[PDB]
Design a protein around this ligand. Structure first.
Ligand SMILES: Cc1cc2nc3c(=O)[nH]c(=O)nc-3n(C[C@H](O)[C@H](O)[C@H](O)COP(=O)(O)OP(=O)(O)OC[C@H]3O[C@@H](n4cnc5c(N)ncnc54)[C@H](O)[C@@H]3O)c2cc1C
Ligand SMILES: Cc1cc2nc3c(=O)[nH]c(=O)nc-3n(C[C@H](O)[C@H](O)[C@H](O)COP(=O)(O)OP(=O)(O)OC[C@H]3O[C@@H](n4cnc5c(N)ncnc54)[C@H](O)[C@@H]3O)c2cc1C
Ligand SMILES: Cc1cc2nc3c(=O)[nH]c(=O)nc-3n(C[C@H](O)[C@H](O)[C@H](O)COP(=O)(O)OP(=O)(O)OC[C@H]3O[C@@H](n4cnc5c(N)ncnc54)[C@H](O)[C@@H]3O)c2cc1C
Ligand SMILES: Cc1cc2nc3c(=O)[nH]c(=O)nc-3n(C[C@H](O)[C@H](O)[C@H](O)COP(=O)(O)OP(=O)(O)OC[C@H]3O[C@@H](n4cnc5c(N)ncnc54)[C@H](O)[C@@H]3O)c2cc1C
Lengths: 370, 370, 370, 370
């Protein structure tokens, strides 16, 4: 009589789903393909919507401890400050990926979610069968495809989809704050430092706490120096001379990668007892920093619709219908912003842009009016 | 079998108590002595702790709509900016008194709390009798003394107490923002503008929204010009020339008052079926802006301890024991700050100062670590 | 026994020569081709070297009255201030062309220099004959070719020369200061506002006094909108939105012209009794603002070498040899700066750049060390 | 037939007089009471009027080399910048006393002025006799009393006079610039840092060149800590924390003195062949920094009136009548400013205040209109 859930993927969407289900009394197993539990991408921004999921999950406290809300979100064009935005009090937070990952993992273990590493889902059956690459076949009343842009839960079933892998990307790193060495300035701020002249180079400057700074170094793939890993110090120091102490530390990082952006969109998110969540269903452009946020919201809302006493198949359909438009709208707007370079203008966190952040999954309303 | 509560006082503490009790299924009546429901004091700051009570009460949304979180809390000494503080993301909000009052009243009516105006509690009996000035005697399983610094619920029973009414005070007003007329500056900020030379004059500058600015004009009682109502425009414009457009509007206000500060402290907050909440029990200095906050927290926590299935008498005792030390500590620290003029130094919203704001009544933990 | 000088051209170089000669007791006539005495180019910067000539000429006082030394010389790149320079006290001054012109004309009339308008020099003979377009032939012991880049005194004799007329230019205008309307800023500054993105547009912002602002609007000839006269308001307001009140006034000016830069360099400046001064001999790029300065210095120094009791032919040769290298060096450096866009970097008024300004013609030394 | 001048005092006024006279062909001797030629007072401000005297004296170049014109003259009240003034281009300069002293001494020796140290004038006779403390009696056609506030040339003759020695004073020092250690700011500026709260303490911050900073530390005599020598570091660092690296160096200075202000005014400046110049005749308050300036102007103008071919007695009378009102007006205004603390308001270098600086002794007109 205990409902059994099998979750594929140990990213933010999967740990979120697993926790939310385990809290509602599901018997939950989670399968991570990688040989250990880890998050990639250096750092991450969360907002009101995502922090509310964390609250719902019983993991907000561990997240807030040792993370950072900057006094302001600042934008520069050609070293000239063009905007400072605080979103009329709307909560937000910057942290390392590991930090967010550890909190979710620790919460999941505390609740006794069963976790398997080196455990890859290769096939899913909408009647509630999951097949692992070991050949083990698992039965469950619910299957969660949270297995990322390359989701095998998705693709073994067949979902009508558009996927795009961009040619351009960025280099994400964590370095020491070097705050004293930076000298005079507002170095606790989020600072988005755009340039088109003399070259197209941009740094997103993002403190995670008193010790760790998150840097996104962005330049087109066609620029050999800017796209270089480990970082071509000279060309980054040249256009960002004030960040030299941090850029120096960044250049020691041999594991730096130039990762490319990637998006996915599906005509639907469910089939029978199978639900897709996160990048598996809706990877989007980084512009509004809502990829993990939407993923977590949708994962948490999935647990919610499963508490209505309908069949799992009906709940999944009601779930998509309820929650999806927020994601579609955010994905679209984020892609638009990316393509138009809209953030470069500053003051672009309009009410529409913040619609996803403003959403409170817990009470299913929009908060923090702008 | 329905528990019956009688609440004396329609201030923030009383509306909070009434709502929280009505939500838990209490049959609730609230008695306001004044001939109509109204809040005095122009404007008010709330923090995380208080916003969480609002959430608990189902009234946060109406409060957030049309109120304001400044981008920063700034301090000036002699027109020189000495600090900017954002409390590492800790939520806060500025609003007019009416705004907070209307939200609570509207929520209370929506839940069907019975409200009586021109209804003054003059005597309370710890066995659960309340006597109104009309001579009507009401029975209830719980009596809430939320009737302010001059609480008759308190004094008709007899509580060992220290009360202090200060000689000094301030003039609190709401005027138009006049934002364009203010010209260049950071006019959405909270700005606490201290001066000791050439005179002791201070303005707390506090935007409530795009339309309404909340001003606290502070000068010692012994200064005839500064303490004057309606405001002596010349002496305020002189030391605050940049606020002239607002000060001009303020000087039209004939209802301006120089109210004095007032504190109360009691050796205990309960007797039998009677609980004291708010200024009735713990009026404090304005320095940490936590008078209404502590009041609301304590009122909401009272509802909480009444859900443990113990007698009302045991619940009230467990309530005080649980929640009081936060208030005692905040009151004390606030008085210290007031006396030492500690806020004038800037950067004084230390972790200890923010202890009350950091408290989350809903989950009974401290959040937003500093 | 009274020495007789004939001067061709009523620009700054010619009025300077005429005055300096008349002060030393020369009988002086000056011939202006144009039908009236007037100066074109809206505004002008002078420096120490040029102000010392003015002093020597007895015309400094009229110049200082109603002109302007900005508190600082500021440079912007993409609306970001990149330098502020004050040249370690070295005197400088901004004024309208008319202002400088009127002072020289008034001084020349006061000394009784004979001035003829509609009087064009078409031929000069190194034995001391000047022919006017009326056919009048004048004899003199000295002939001054101060007749501009198209000097007929020069060309009727034949001077080995390189002349260059550029394709690019700028629009020079005088408009009201509109200082209040500009609002917050440092609007008494000289501000050199460079941009390469999103277009190559630059404004030199140059207050002449409390009433008059001198604007240089620079854009390549190949840009149809930027090079347009009267000014294409939209494309200038777009990249210089903070100057809108002035740009609005500027757009009313129907007489605005897009003048092109022009340079001249000759293997020598003298022949017999004929000397060439100013643009006739050494027109240069505008970068170091030393065209009129060098012209005036060289014109004043010519008067100086004529007081040594040598023949006029020997004096002219000693004159060139003495004074020319300063001009050659300044011309060259200015052309270099122009071509490299060196001023865009800011802080480029190095000691070498200021070498011409630092020169004191009166005492024949370099002053104001850097 | 060679006119013979005897000058008492080797300060700025006496060296100025001596040089100016020696240039006009006077046979000049100068008597310095002190055992060596030296100037006290750490640093000094000069202006247009004084720099023109230097020019007239043939000593400007040595002065400009290794001295400093700040980009701006800034005023602070309670660490808040209240004004920045550049005097519409009017020349000025800051330098150490020694620097100004050495230039004058070197020029005087170069011209062959005869200089005697340990040579004190004790008596002067208006018929042209000077008596040295050695008992040597010198005859001359002119006697210059440039022997300071305690002038024996003055007092041995008897001049109706008011002298005032104030109770308050200041500590003048030269320390290293420590510019890097000062960090962010405008550290080449003259900065006049006023405070009345929490104490009456003021620093005049005055860079002399890239190596040397001139500091005036001012506090009332009645403050034991502020008036202390060597400096009470703690009380100066407390109110000027940003100057700590310099204040630290200043506290090593054992020769620091708290000198008091002193003024003198006489009903006349001449008697027969005797003229009084400088502090001997017109010591004034430091406020407009024109004590040495007026002294030098008056000393230089004395040489001027001696070239009119009248008797020395008539020239001296014409001299006083011509030049004195500028000094009387400047002295008076400076005393007013001192008493009213007028400079503390900022923007107080009005046209009237700058009247002395604006005066050009060389051409006997006022320049640099404001
Ligand atoms: C440059 C960049 C910046 C971004 N910044 C932000 C930001 O600031 N804020 C924000 O909210 N979002 C941000 N995002 C987006 C965010 O990173 C993603 O939306 C989010 O991490 C998606 O998480 P997920 O769990 O759905 O997928 P993933 O994080 O990809 O996780 C799935 C986990 O899947 C495991 N796995 C894969 N296949 C299998 C399988 N077959 N079986 C079992 N396990 C499997 C994967 O290995 C991994 O362990 C950013 C994205 C990019 C590219
Ligand atoms: C200058 C100043 C600034 C302040 N700023 C802040 C701030 O920024 N943030 C903050 O949180 N707090 C602030 N406070 C404190 C805050 O105002 C109080 O702590 C709060 O309003 C107390 O509310 P209460 O409901 O307990 O009492 P009250 O607001 O006094 O309310 C009781 C209500 O009691 C009614 N009543 C009285 N007697 C009877 C009776 N006998 N029978 C029936 N009804 C009765 C009263 O008339 C009224 O309607 C400030 C206080 C001052 C003085
Ligand atoms: C855009 C721009 C900005 C500049 N800015 C500065 C600056 O800020 N500071 C500075 O010092 N310099 C500046 N200059 C350069 C400066 O304008 C010239 O160097 C200066 O005006 C040359 O003066 P001139 O008297 O030699 O020649 P002109 O000013 O050309 O004067 C000669 C006069 O010659 C008359 N004339 C011509 N032919 C005859 C003839 N045949 N017979 C009789 N009369 C004749 C001309 O009509 C006119 O009246 C700038 C130049 C440009 C192009
Ligand atoms: C705090 C302070 C700050 C000041 N700042 C400035 C400033 O910034 N700019 C400015 O222009 N002015 C300033 N002044 C004023 C300026 O210092 C004086 O006006 C100036 O130094 C007067 O010079 P003097 O040569 O007349 O007298 P002194 O400098 O006193 O010189 C006379 C010389 O007299 C020698 N002597 C004295 N008696 C005899 C004698 N009997 N026989 C022979 N020799 C004798 C003295 O010993 C000395 O060598 C300031 C003054 C003060 C107090």
């Amino acid at each position: 009589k205990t409902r059994r859930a099998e979750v594929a993927g140990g990213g933010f969407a999967g740990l979120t789903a697993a926790i939310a289900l385990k809290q509602n009394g599901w018997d939950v197993r989670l399968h991570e393909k990688s040989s250990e539990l880890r998050a990639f991408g250096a750092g991450i921004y969360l907002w009101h919507n995502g922090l509310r999921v964390l609250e719902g999950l019983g993991a907000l406290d561990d997240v807030l401890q040792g993370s950072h809300t900057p006094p302001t979100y600042e934008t520069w064009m050609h070293n000239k400050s063009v905007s400072k935005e605080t979103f009329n009090g709307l909560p937000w937070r910057i942290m390392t990926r590991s930090h967010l990952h550890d909190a979710l993992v620790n919460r999941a273990r505390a609740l006794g979610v069963d976790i398997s590493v080196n455990s890859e889902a290769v096939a899913a059956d909408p009647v509630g069968r999951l097949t692992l690459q070991t050949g083990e076949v698992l039965e469950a009343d619910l299957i969660v495809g949270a297995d990322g842009v390359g989701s095998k839960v998705r693709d073994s079933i067949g979902f009508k989809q558009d996927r795009w892998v961009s040619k351009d990307g960025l280099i994400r790193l964590i370095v020491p704050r070097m705050k004293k060495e930076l000298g005079h300035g507002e170095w606790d701020n989020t600072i988005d430092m755009w340039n088109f002249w003399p070259r197209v180079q941009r740094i997103l400057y993002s403190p995670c706490n008193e010790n760790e700074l998150y840097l996104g170094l962005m330049a087109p793939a066609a620029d050999p120096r800017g796209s270089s890993v480990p970082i071509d110090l000279e060309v980054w120091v040249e256009m960002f001379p004030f960040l030299e102490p941090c850029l120096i530390e960044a250049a020691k990082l041999k594991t730096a990668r130039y990762d490319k952006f990637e998006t996915t969109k599906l005509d639907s998110w469910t089939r029978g007892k199978v639900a897709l969540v996160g990048d598996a269903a809706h990877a989007m452009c980084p512009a509004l920093a809502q990829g993990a946020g939407c993923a977590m919201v949708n994962a948490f809302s999935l647990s919610q619709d499963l508490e209505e006493g309908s069949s799992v198949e009906d709940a999944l359909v009601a779930w998509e219908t309820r929650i999806r438009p927020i994601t579609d709208r955010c994905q679209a707007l984020s892609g638009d912003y990316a393509a138009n370079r809209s953030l470069s203008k500053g003051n672009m966190f309009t009410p529409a842009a913040l619609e996803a952040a403003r959403y409170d999954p817990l009470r299913r309303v929009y908060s923090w009016p702008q």
